[PDB]
PDB file of C-alpha atoms in Angstrom:
ATOM      1  CA  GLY A   1      24.765  18.179 -15.531  1.00 36.54           C
ATOM      2  CA  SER A   2      23.256  15.560 -17.370  1.00 36.26           C
ATOM      3  CA  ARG A   3      19.826  14.018 -16.921  1.00 32.46           C
ATOM      4  CA  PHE A   4      21.004  10.697 -17.453  1.00 32.85           C
ATOM      5  CA  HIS A   5      23.956   8.439 -16.564  1.00 31.84           C
ATOM      6  CA  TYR A   6      25.711   6.960 -19.569  1.00 32.64           C
ATOM      7  CA  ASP A   7      27.980   3.997 -19.916  1.00 38.64           C
ATOM      8  CA  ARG A   8      31.485   4.018 -21.757  1.00 37.49           C
ATOM      9  CA  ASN A   9      29.891   3.649 -24.818  1.00 37.29           C
ATOM     10  CA  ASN A  10      27.295   6.458 -24.347  1.00 36.69           C
ATOM     11  CA  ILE A  11      24.553   4.432 -23.890  1.00 36.66           C
ATOM     12  CA  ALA A  12      22.149   5.874 -21.160  1.00 38.06           C
ATOM     13  CA  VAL A  13      22.025   3.177 -18.510  1.00 39.22           C
ATOM     14  CA  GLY A  14      20.670   5.430 -15.474  1.00 39.73           C
ATOM     15  CA  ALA A  15      19.930   8.619 -13.696  1.00 35.66           C
ATOM     16  CA  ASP A  16      19.946  10.480 -10.538  1.00 37.58           C
ATOM     17  CA  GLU A  17      17.221   9.739  -8.217  1.00 36.63           C
ATOM     18  CA  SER A  18      15.253  12.940  -8.595  1.00 38.32           C
ATOM     19  CA  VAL A  19      15.196  12.466 -12.193  1.00 41.44           C
ATOM     20  CA  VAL A  20      13.357   8.978 -12.132  1.00 39.53           C
ATOM     21  CA  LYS A  21      11.227  10.094  -9.318  1.00 39.29           C
ATOM     22  CA  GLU A  22       9.889  13.046 -11.120  1.00 38.78           C
ATOM     23  CA  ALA A  23       9.065  10.510 -14.440  1.00 40.00           C
ATOM     24  CA  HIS A  24       6.841   8.663 -12.391  1.00 40.12           C
ATOM     25  CA  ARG A  25       5.010  11.409 -10.775  1.00 39.28           C
ATOM     26  CA  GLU A  26       1.825  11.204 -12.721  1.00 37.69           C
ATOM     27  CA  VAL A  27      -0.145   8.153 -12.129  1.00 41.56           C
ATOM     28  CA  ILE A  28      -3.431   7.698 -13.825  1.00 40.00           C
ATOM     29  CA  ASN A  29      -4.914   4.979 -11.759  1.00 42.68           C
ATOM     30  CA  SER A  30      -3.634   2.964  -8.648  1.00 44.58           C
ATOM     31  CA  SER A  31      -5.166  -0.544  -7.530  1.00 45.29           C
ATOM     32  CA  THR A  32      -3.832  -3.670  -6.078  1.00 45.44           C
ATOM     33  CA  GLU A  33      -3.632  -4.797  -9.639  1.00 48.24           C
ATOM     34  CA  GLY A  34      -1.040  -2.365 -10.400  1.00 46.55           C
ATOM     35  CA  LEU A  35      -0.226   1.426 -11.378  1.00 45.12           C
ATOM     36  CA  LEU A  36      -1.271   3.034 -14.711  1.00 44.32           C
ATOM     37  CA  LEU A  37       0.949   6.012 -15.804  1.00 43.77           C
ATOM     38  CA  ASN A  38       2.479   7.710 -18.660  1.00 43.84           C
ATOM     39  CA  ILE A  39       6.195   7.097 -18.569  1.00 39.42           C
ATOM     40  CA  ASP A  40       8.578   8.766 -21.102  1.00 40.07           C
ATOM     41  CA  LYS A  41      10.184   6.521 -23.459  1.00 39.14           C
ATOM     42  CA  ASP A  42      13.740   7.598 -22.552  1.00 39.19           C
ATOM     43  CA  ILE A  43      13.132   7.004 -19.213  1.00 40.70           C
ATOM     44  CA  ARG A  44      11.590   3.162 -19.838  1.00 41.52           C
ATOM     45  CA  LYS A  45      14.915   2.662 -21.623  1.00 42.90           C
ATOM     46  CA  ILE A  46      17.136   3.272 -18.791  1.00 47.93           C
ATOM     47  CA  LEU A  47      15.315   0.533 -16.323  1.00 46.57           C
ATOM     48  CA  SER A  48      15.524  -3.111 -15.862  1.00 44.65           C
ATOM     49  CA  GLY A  49      11.952  -3.046 -14.090  1.00 48.18           C
ATOM     50  CA  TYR A  50      10.239  -2.439 -11.080  1.00 50.20           C
ATOM     51  CA  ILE A  51      10.387  -3.940  -7.440  1.00 46.74           C
ATOM     52  CA  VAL A  52       6.871  -4.095  -5.530  1.00 46.25           C
ATOM     53  CA  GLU A  53       6.971  -4.080  -1.862  1.00 47.60           C
ATOM     54  CA  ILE A  54       4.063  -4.196   0.893  1.00 48.16           C
ATOM     55  CA  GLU A  55       5.034  -2.502   3.973  1.00 52.80           C
ATOM     56  CA  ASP A  56       3.170  -3.087   7.430  1.00 52.44           C
ATOM     57  CA  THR A  57       2.465  -0.656  10.018  1.00 51.25           C
ATOM     58  CA  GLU A  58       5.618  -2.137  11.958  1.00 50.17           C
ATOM     59  CA  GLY A  59       7.821  -1.344   9.314  1.00 48.58           C
ATOM     60  CA  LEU A  60       8.298  -4.700   8.313  1.00 49.12           C
ATOM     61  CA  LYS A  61       8.529  -5.136   4.278  1.00 50.71           C
ATOM     62  CA  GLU A  62       7.595  -7.974   1.836  1.00 52.09           C
ATOM     63  CA  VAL A  63       8.896  -7.950  -1.704  1.00 49.65           C
ATOM     64  CA  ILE A  64       6.257  -9.477  -3.895  1.00 47.65           C
ATOM     65  CA  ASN A  65       8.712 -10.075  -7.118  1.00 44.14           C
ATOM     66  CA  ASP A  66      11.725 -10.961  -5.201  1.00 43.11           C
ATOM     67  CA  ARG A  67      14.268 -12.356  -7.812  1.00 43.77           C
ATOM     68  CA  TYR A  68      16.639 -10.656  -9.935  1.00 42.43           C
ATOM     69  CA  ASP A  69      14.883 -12.017 -12.789  1.00 43.52           C
ATOM     70  CA  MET A  70      11.208 -10.704 -11.867  1.00 41.65           C
ATOM     71  CA  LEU A  71      11.794  -7.409 -12.244  1.00 40.95           C
ATOM     72  CA  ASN A  72      10.090  -7.155 -15.617  1.00 42.15           C
ATOM     73  CA  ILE A  73       6.647  -6.235 -14.699  1.00 42.40           C
ATOM     74  CA  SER A  74       5.541  -3.356 -16.809  1.00 42.41           C
ATOM     75  CA  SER A  75       4.281  -3.076 -20.407  1.00 44.11           C
ATOM     76  CA  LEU A  76       2.576  -0.715 -22.782  1.00 48.11           C
ATOM     77  CA  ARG A  77      -1.056  -0.544 -23.632  1.00 47.29           C
ATOM     78  CA  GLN A  78      -2.032  -0.129 -27.020  1.00 47.56           C
ATOM     79  CA  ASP A  79      -2.234   3.618 -26.527  1.00 45.77           C
ATOM     80  CA  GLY A  80       1.170   4.112 -25.001  1.00 46.39           C
ATOM     81  CA  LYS A  81       0.614   4.335 -21.514  1.00 48.24           C
ATOM     82  CA  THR A  82       2.660   1.988 -18.914  1.00 46.23           C
ATOM     83  CA  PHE A  83       1.055  -0.564 -16.455  1.00 45.38           C
ATOM     84  CA  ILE A  84       3.163  -2.023 -13.681  1.00 43.10           C
ATOM     85  CA  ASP A  85       1.813  -5.208 -13.026  1.00 42.49           C
ATOM     86  CA  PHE A  86       1.535  -6.395  -9.455  1.00 42.71           C
ATOM     87  CA  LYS A  87      -0.140  -9.522 -10.244  1.00 41.02           C
ATOM     88  CA  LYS A  88       2.325 -11.237 -12.594  1.00 39.48           C
ATOM     89  CA  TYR A  89       4.618 -12.451  -9.922  1.00 39.18           C
ATOM     90  CA  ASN A  90       1.752 -12.459  -7.488  1.00 40.39           C
ATOM     91  CA  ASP A  91       0.574 -15.941  -8.477  1.00 42.24           C
ATOM     92  CA  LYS A  92      -1.384 -13.919 -10.885  1.00 40.84           C
ATOM     93  CA  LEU A  93      -3.551 -12.419  -8.165  1.00 38.11           C
ATOM     94  CA  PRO A  94      -4.332  -8.524  -7.017  1.00 36.19           C
ATOM     95  CA  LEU A  95      -2.311  -7.716  -4.140  1.00 36.76           C
ATOM     96  CA  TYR A  96      -3.537  -8.609  -0.672  1.00 36.23           C
ATOM     97  CA  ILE A  97      -3.416  -5.421   1.624  1.00 37.08           C
ATOM     98  CA  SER A  98      -4.591  -6.641   4.943  1.00 35.14           C
ATOM     99  CA  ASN A  99      -5.047  -3.300   6.833  1.00 35.40           C
ATOM    100  CA  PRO A 100      -5.613   0.010   5.114  1.00 31.34           C
ATOM    101  CA  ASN A 101      -2.528   1.535   6.882  1.00 31.46           C
ATOM    102  CA  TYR A 102       0.086  -0.985   5.091  1.00 32.40           C
ATOM    103  CA  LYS A 103       1.666   0.586   2.341  1.00 33.72           C
ATOM    104  CA  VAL A 104       2.528  -0.332  -1.255  1.00 33.89           C
ATOM    105  CA  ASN A 105       5.934   0.701  -2.401  1.00 31.57           C
ATOM    106  CA  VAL A 106       7.207   0.539  -5.753  1.00 32.91           C
ATOM    107  CA  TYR A 107      10.876   0.970  -6.829  1.00 34.03           C
ATOM    108  CA  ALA A 108      12.416   1.415 -10.226  1.00 34.11           C
ATOM    109  CA  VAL A 109      15.735  -0.277 -11.028  1.00 34.46           C
ATOM    110  CA  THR A 110      17.943   1.201 -13.438  1.00 35.60           C
ATOM    111  CA  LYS A 111      19.980  -0.766 -15.887  1.00 36.40           C
ATOM    112  CA  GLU A 112      23.695   0.314 -14.196  1.00 35.34           C
ATOM    113  CA  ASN A 113      21.999  -1.266 -11.012  1.00 35.06           C
ATOM    114  CA  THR A 114      21.135  -4.622 -12.547  1.00 34.66           C
ATOM    115  CA  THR A 115      18.897 -14.676  -6.697  1.00 36.91           C
ATOM    116  CA  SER A 116      17.220 -12.350  -4.517  1.00 37.34           C
ATOM    117  CA  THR A 117      16.272  -8.348  -5.047  1.00 36.32           C
ATOM    118  CA  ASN A 118      17.712  -7.532  -1.642  1.00 34.24           C
ATOM    119  CA  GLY A 119      21.155  -5.409  -2.475  1.00 32.20           C
ATOM    120  CA  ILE A 120      19.635  -4.187  -5.439  1.00 32.53           C
ATOM    121  CA  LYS A 121      19.971  -0.481  -5.335  1.00 36.19           C
ATOM    122  CA  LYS A 122      16.624   1.010  -6.256  1.00 37.79           C
ATOM    123  CA  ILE A 123      14.534   4.055  -6.569  1.00 39.61           C
ATOM    124  CA  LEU A 124      11.318   4.802  -4.815  1.00 38.78           C
ATOM    125  CA  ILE A 125       8.834   5.752  -7.171  1.00 38.94           C
ATOM    126  CA  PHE A 126       5.350   5.459  -5.414  1.00 39.13           C
ATOM    127  CA  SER A 127       4.526   5.025  -2.086  1.00 41.12           C
ATOM    128  CA  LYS A 128       0.695   5.035  -0.734  1.00 41.23           C
ATOM    129  CA  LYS A 129      -1.325   3.489   2.142  1.00 41.77           C
ATOM    130  CA  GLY A 130      -4.177   1.019   1.214  1.00 43.05           C
ATOM    131  CA  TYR A 131      -6.812   3.715   1.965  1.00 37.94           C
ATOM    132  CA  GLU A 132      -5.143   5.873  -0.758  1.00 36.43           C
ATOM    133  CA  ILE A 133      -5.362   2.902  -3.511  1.00 36.14           C
ATOM    134  CA  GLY A 134      -8.353   1.573  -5.416  1.00 37.23           C
TER     135      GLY A 134
ATOM    136  CA  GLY B   1     -29.049  -6.318   4.767  1.00 36.20           C
ATOM    137  CA  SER B   2     -26.630  -3.946   3.156  1.00 34.57           C
ATOM    138  CA  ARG B   3     -27.728  -2.129  -0.223  1.00 35.54           C
ATOM    139  CA  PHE B   4     -24.296  -1.885  -1.490  1.00 34.60           C
ATOM    140  CA  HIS B   5     -21.165  -4.035  -1.280  1.00 30.71           C
ATOM    141  CA  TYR B   6     -18.050  -2.611   0.015  1.00 29.59           C
ATOM    142  CA  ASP B   7     -14.188  -3.049  -0.666  1.00 33.51           C
ATOM    143  CA  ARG B   8     -11.395  -3.415   1.867  1.00 31.65           C
ATOM    144  CA  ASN B   9     -11.451   0.253   2.472  1.00 31.72           C
ATOM    145  CA  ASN B  10     -15.334   0.399   3.524  1.00 32.00           C
ATOM    146  CA  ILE B  11     -16.025   2.033   0.082  1.00 33.69           C
ATOM    147  CA  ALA B  12     -19.129   1.048  -2.076  1.00 31.75           C
ATOM    148  CA  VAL B  13     -18.088  -0.794  -5.151  1.00 30.93           C
ATOM    149  CA  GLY B  14     -20.919  -2.898  -6.266  1.00 32.37           C
ATOM    150  CA  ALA B  15     -24.542  -3.824  -5.131  1.00 33.90           C
ATOM    151  CA  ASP B  16     -27.019  -6.879  -5.947  1.00 35.91           C
ATOM    152  CA  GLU B  17     -28.443  -6.874  -9.475  1.00 33.49           C
ATOM    153  CA  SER B  18     -32.080  -5.746  -8.180  1.00 32.55           C
ATOM    154  CA  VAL B  19     -30.741  -2.532  -6.663  1.00 34.86           C
ATOM    155  CA  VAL B  20     -28.710  -1.681  -9.919  1.00 35.70           C
ATOM    156  CA  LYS B  21     -31.662  -2.508 -12.222  1.00 31.82           C
ATOM    157  CA  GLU B  22     -34.226  -0.426  -9.971  1.00 32.09           C
ATOM    158  CA  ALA B  23     -31.994   2.581 -10.126  1.00 31.50           C
ATOM    159  CA  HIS B  24     -31.925   2.635 -13.801  1.00 32.05           C
ATOM    160  CA  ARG B  25     -35.762   1.811 -14.120  1.00 30.61           C
ATOM    161  CA  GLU B  26     -37.190   4.947 -15.195  1.00 30.36           C
ATOM    162  CA  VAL B  27     -35.999   6.144 -18.671  1.00 31.73           C
ATOM    163  CA  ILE B  28     -36.795   9.861 -19.727  1.00 29.63           C
ATOM    164  CA  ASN B  29     -36.107   9.200 -23.374  1.00 28.47           C
ATOM    165  CA  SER B  30     -34.619   6.278 -25.053  1.00 26.54           C
ATOM    166  CA  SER B  31     -33.308   6.757 -28.861  1.00 28.48           C
ATOM    167  CA  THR B  32     -30.906   5.404 -31.223  1.00 33.03           C
ATOM    168  CA  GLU B  33     -28.464   8.037 -30.134  1.00 32.10           C
ATOM    169  CA  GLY B  34     -28.587   6.634 -26.211  1.00 32.41           C
ATOM    170  CA  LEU B  35     -30.602   7.169 -22.962  1.00 32.26           C
ATOM    171  CA  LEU B  36     -31.657   9.909 -20.753  1.00 29.25           C
ATOM    172  CA  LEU B  37     -32.531   9.308 -17.098  1.00 29.86           C
ATOM    173  CA  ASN B  38     -31.878  10.361 -13.495  1.00 27.98           C
ATOM    174  CA  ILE B  39     -29.491   8.256 -11.605  1.00 25.63           C
ATOM    175  CA  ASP B  40     -28.991   8.540  -7.820  1.00 25.47           C
ATOM    176  CA  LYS B  41     -25.329   9.843  -7.284  1.00 26.59           C
ATOM    177  CA  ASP B  42     -24.516   6.841  -5.168  1.00 28.60           C
ATOM    178  CA  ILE B  43     -25.518   4.311  -7.677  1.00 30.20           C
ATOM    179  CA  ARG B  44     -23.550   6.182 -10.257  1.00 32.57           C
ATOM    180  CA  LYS B  45     -20.347   6.084  -8.009  1.00 31.89           C
ATOM    181  CA  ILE B  46     -20.488   2.261  -7.970  1.00 33.78           C
ATOM    182  CA  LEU B  47     -20.435   2.172 -11.760  1.00 30.66           C
ATOM    183  CA  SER B  48     -17.667   1.715 -14.057  1.00 29.94           C
ATOM    184  CA  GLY B  49     -19.974   2.508 -16.995  1.00 26.87           C
ATOM    185  CA  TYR B  50     -22.157   0.266 -19.708  1.00 29.05           C
ATOM    186  CA  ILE B  51     -22.061  -2.013 -22.373  1.00 29.70           C
ATOM    187  CA  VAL B  52     -24.415  -1.490 -25.460  1.00 30.60           C
ATOM    188  CA  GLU B  53     -25.431  -4.427 -27.406  1.00 34.22           C
ATOM    189  CA  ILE B  54     -27.762  -5.205 -30.530  1.00 33.18           C
ATOM    190  CA  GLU B  55     -29.597  -8.438 -30.365  1.00 30.36           C
ATOM    191  CA  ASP B  56     -31.522 -10.017 -33.114  1.00 29.61           C
ATOM    192  CA  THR B  57     -34.655 -12.138 -33.164  1.00 28.53           C
ATOM    193  CA  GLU B  58     -32.349 -15.171 -33.397  1.00 25.93           C
ATOM    194  CA  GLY B  59     -30.781 -14.310 -30.133  1.00 22.60           C
ATOM    195  CA  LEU B  60     -27.343 -13.287 -31.784  1.00 20.52           C
ATOM    196  CA  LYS B  61     -25.656 -10.442 -30.055  1.00 22.02           C
ATOM    197  CA  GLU B  62     -23.479  -7.643 -31.260  1.00 22.16           C
ATOM    198  CA  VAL B  63     -21.659  -5.551 -28.700  1.00 22.77           C
ATOM    199  CA  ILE B  64     -21.060  -1.954 -29.688  1.00 20.63           C
ATOM    200  CA  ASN B  65     -18.615  -0.952 -27.381  1.00 21.72           C
ATOM    201  CA  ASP B  66     -16.587  -3.865 -27.014  1.00 17.61           C
ATOM    202  CA  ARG B  67     -13.557  -2.929 -25.136  1.00 18.13           C
ATOM    203  CA  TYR B  68     -12.374  -2.922 -21.476  1.00 17.79           C
ATOM    204  CA  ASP B  69     -11.363   0.758 -21.983  1.00 18.94           C
ATOM    205  CA  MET B  70     -14.789   1.829 -23.714  1.00 17.37           C
ATOM    206  CA  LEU B  71     -17.278   1.282 -20.669  1.00 16.69           C
ATOM    207  CA  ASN B  72     -17.140   5.296 -20.337  1.00 17.56           C
ATOM    208  CA  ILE B  73     -20.224   6.275 -22.214  1.00 14.42           C
ATOM    209  CA  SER B  74     -22.289   8.175 -19.602  1.00 16.31           C
ATOM    210  CA  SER B  75     -22.085  11.601 -18.483  1.00 18.70           C
ATOM    211  CA  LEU B  76     -24.047  13.953 -16.550  1.00 21.13           C
ATOM    212  CA  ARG B  77     -25.814  16.865 -18.937  1.00 18.18           C
ATOM    213  CA  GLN B  78     -26.395  20.391 -17.829  1.00 14.86           C
ATOM    214  CA  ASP B  79     -29.762  19.648 -15.892  1.00 13.26           C
ATOM    215  CA  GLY B  80     -28.034  16.877 -13.933  1.00 11.05           C
ATOM    216  CA  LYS B  81     -29.546  13.886 -15.781  1.00  8.45           C
ATOM    217  CA  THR B  82     -27.351  10.914 -17.043  1.00  7.19           C
ATOM    218  CA  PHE B  83     -26.894  10.328 -20.615  1.00  6.63           C
ATOM    219  CA  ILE B  84     -25.581   7.232 -21.856  1.00  5.37           C
ATOM    220  CA  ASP B  85     -24.198   7.885 -25.557  1.00  3.10           C
ATOM    221  CA  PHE B  86     -24.628   4.965 -27.840  1.00  4.09           C
ATOM    222  CA  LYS B  87     -22.708   7.191 -30.806  1.00  3.69           C
ATOM    223  CA  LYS B  88     -19.311   7.609 -28.803  1.00  4.36           C
ATOM    224  CA  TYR B  89     -17.871   3.944 -29.653  1.00  4.05           C
ATOM    225  CA  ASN B  90     -19.868   3.735 -32.603  1.00  6.07           C
ATOM    226  CA  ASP B  91     -17.999   5.557 -35.371  1.00  9.47           C
ATOM    227  CA  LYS B  92     -19.962   8.543 -33.752  1.00  7.07           C
ATOM    228  CA  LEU B  93     -23.278   7.571 -35.080  1.00  5.79           C
ATOM    229  CA  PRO B  94     -26.686   6.522 -33.674  1.00  4.82           C
ATOM    230  CA  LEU B  95     -27.394   2.753 -33.597  1.00  3.75           C
ATOM    231  CA  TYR B  96     -28.762   1.355 -36.799  1.00  2.05           C
ATOM    232  CA  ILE B  97     -31.522  -1.213 -35.847  1.00  2.00           C
ATOM    233  CA  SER B  98     -32.171  -3.338 -39.065  1.00  2.71           C
ATOM    234  CA  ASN B  99     -35.373  -4.565 -38.109  1.00  5.30           C
ATOM    235  CA  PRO B 100     -37.906  -3.021 -35.636  1.00  2.91           C
ATOM    236  CA  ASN B 101     -38.149  -6.540 -33.655  1.00  2.00           C
ATOM    237  CA  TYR B 102     -34.295  -6.133 -32.764  1.00  2.00           C
ATOM    238  CA  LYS B 103     -33.528  -5.353 -29.310  1.00  4.03           C
ATOM    239  CA  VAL B 104     -31.221  -2.815 -28.097  1.00  5.89           C
ATOM    240  CA  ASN B 105     -29.660  -3.999 -24.661  1.00  5.38           C
ATOM    241  CA  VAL B 106     -27.852  -2.010 -21.989  1.00  6.58           C
ATOM    242  CA  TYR B 107     -25.654  -3.502 -19.221  1.00  8.35           C
ATOM    243  CA  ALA B 108     -24.321  -1.781 -16.161  1.00  9.10           C
ATOM    244  CA  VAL B 109     -20.861  -2.861 -14.996  1.00  7.43           C
ATOM    245  CA  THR B 110     -19.844  -2.214 -11.267  1.00  6.40           C
ATOM    246  CA  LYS B 111     -16.779  -1.227  -9.977  1.00  4.77           C
ATOM    247  CA  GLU B 112     -16.137  -4.530  -8.330  1.00  4.81           C
ATOM    248  CA  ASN B 113     -16.544  -6.326 -11.639  1.00  2.47           C
ATOM    249  CA  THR B 114     -14.723  -4.439 -13.826  1.00  2.51           C
ATOM    250  CA  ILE B 115     -11.764  -5.012 -15.845  1.00  3.51           C
ATOM    251  CA  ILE B 116      -8.736  -2.625 -14.961  1.00  2.00           C
ATOM    252  CA  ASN B 117      -6.170  -4.124 -17.324  1.00  2.29           C
ATOM    253  CA  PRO B 118      -6.278  -6.320 -20.006  1.00  2.00           C
ATOM    254  CA  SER B 119      -5.410 -10.314 -19.056  1.00  2.00           C
ATOM    255  CA  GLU B 120      -2.068 -11.622 -19.244  1.00  4.10           C
ATOM    256  CA  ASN B 121      -3.453 -13.412 -22.551  1.00  3.43           C
ATOM    257  CA  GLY B 122      -3.636 -10.032 -23.950  1.00  5.06           C
ATOM    258  CA  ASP B 123      -7.692  -9.898 -24.233  1.00  5.27           C
ATOM    259  CA  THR B 124      -8.990  -6.301 -24.390  1.00  6.08           C
ATOM    260  CA  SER B 125     -12.729  -7.583 -24.666  1.00  5.93           C
ATOM    261  CA  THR B 126     -15.758  -7.574 -22.158  1.00  5.68           C
ATOM    262  CA  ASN B 127     -16.698 -10.602 -23.219  1.00  3.13           C
ATOM    263  CA  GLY B 128     -16.903 -12.668 -20.163  1.00  3.09           C
ATOM    264  CA  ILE B 129     -17.115  -9.306 -17.751  1.00  5.06           C
ATOM    265  CA  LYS B 130     -20.005  -9.737 -15.466  1.00  3.27           C
ATOM    266  CA  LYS B 131     -22.326  -7.124 -16.044  1.00  3.23           C
ATOM    267  CA  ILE B 132     -26.173  -6.266 -15.128  1.00  2.00           C
ATOM    268  CA  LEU B 133     -28.841  -5.840 -17.809  1.00  3.54           C
ATOM    269  CA  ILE B 134     -30.556  -2.416 -17.121  1.00  2.00           C
ATOM    270  CA  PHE B 135     -32.350  -1.576 -20.391  1.00  2.00           C
ATOM    271  CA  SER B 136     -33.599  -4.136 -22.856  1.00  2.00           C
ATOM    272  CA  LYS B 137     -36.282  -2.723 -25.573  1.00  2.00           C
ATOM    273  CA  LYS B 138     -37.153  -3.570 -28.949  1.00  2.00           C
ATOM    274  CA  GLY B 139     -36.684  -1.111 -31.837  1.00  2.00           C
ATOM    275  CA  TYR B 140     -40.149  -0.121 -32.149  1.00  2.00           C
ATOM    276  CA  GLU B 141     -39.976   0.518 -28.254  1.00  2.00           C
ATOM    277  CA  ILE B 142     -37.207   3.161 -29.082  1.00  2.00           C
ATOM    278  CA  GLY B 143     -37.326   6.578 -30.169  1.00  2.00           C
TER     279      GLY B 143
END
């Protein structure tokens, strides 16, 4: 099979979940400001961005960057590493995690899956409890 | 009161300046290549690293390792002592102190005060980082 999904002009616009999931498996650093990781350029090119969501112990979810045009929250450091920035669309503040058992879920959105983010098809690429984040 | 400052996970991430300074007070060797000293593991754990600065007689200051991602100049050597390496981000050379009255200042940066990622303005400097002076000696006081 092929690692990526291609559109009708053979431009890569997506990938199966397992592929996207595996590409984000190496986290260098996590904190309430965001995630630092190495992401392959060819993976970066198939994504429109990321959705950031806090989930409480009752399973209730809150999307922090909750509009279709607030998905662009990752950028590259001078050294090539990717920072997915929780603060950018959170009033430039770190995430507030009120209980260490709350979860921070980050989802990747592929270009073929791109006002709200509900209804956006997305790929869970990071999920940790507050006590497991910096 | 409490020796350390604790984060939302009840992990120590800082402390009052008096505690940090006191934990670095006793230096085994100071040279232009850096500082050798014993630091308590529990203090090491609350630090992101150190900023090294040369300060002339007129008070003009030069930070040697000036970036948010260059604080990591400390390590444990074979005997468990900490060595704060002045060469690491100094083009791999020892500090050049032009005049023996000039100072070398070293500041510690605690985890709660560290800069994890550059600002949205794209600033990668330590200017403005909150930091704690833990060593300040003139050239003639330095090996």
